[PDB]
A paper describes a structure:
In this study, we designed SCM mutants by substituting the Cys41 residue with three hydrophobic amino acid residues—i.e., Ala, Val, and Leu—generating SCM C41A, C41V, and C41L, respectively. Differential scanning fluorimetric analysis revealed that substituting Cys41 with Ala or Val increased the thermal stability of SCM, while substitution with Ser or Leu decreased its stability. Furthermore, under all three different pH conditions the relative order of the Tm values of the SCM mutants was the same; that is, C41A > C41V > WT > C41S > C41L. The SCM C41A and C41V mutants were crystallized under slightly different conditions, resulting in having different space groups (i.e., P1 for C41A, and P21 for C41V). The mode of dimer formation in both SCM C41A and C41V was similar to that seen in the WT. Models for all 94 residues were successfully constructed for the C41V mutant, while the models for the loop between the β2 and β3 strands (i.e., residues Glu48–Arg51) in the C41A mutant could not be constructed due to poor electron densities. In addition, the two molecules in an asymmetric unit were superimposed Cα-RMSD values of 0.177 Å and 0.356 Å for SCM C41A and C41V, respectively. In the SCM C41A and C41V mutants, the main chain structures around the 41st residue were found to be almost identical to those of WT SCM and the C41S mutant. The superior thermal stability observed after substitution with Ala or Val may therefore be attributed to the absence of their side-chain deprotonation, which can decrease thermal stability, as well as their interactions with surrounding residues.
Numbering used by the authors: 1 to 47, 52 to 94
The structure:
Amino acid sequence: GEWEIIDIGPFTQNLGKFAVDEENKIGQYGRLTFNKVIRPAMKKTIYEIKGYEYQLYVYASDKLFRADISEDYKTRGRKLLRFNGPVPPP
């Protein structure tokens, strides 16, 4: 696949919210409150397209985490791949 840097507009913020919502279902960090996604946001496109992956820096409950998210082209399904941290600011 190929990687590009993307903006941190509303669509990206909603991916961050997705990630925190999914991590809350897992419960590994306890209950987290989504704050914001910060730069840099990275997007991978996997080939007709199979899907996408995102690597995001997400503040939740005033702590910084790294979240990876997949998105399937044909099913539109999103999945949280991993959620790690706290991490230092980029």
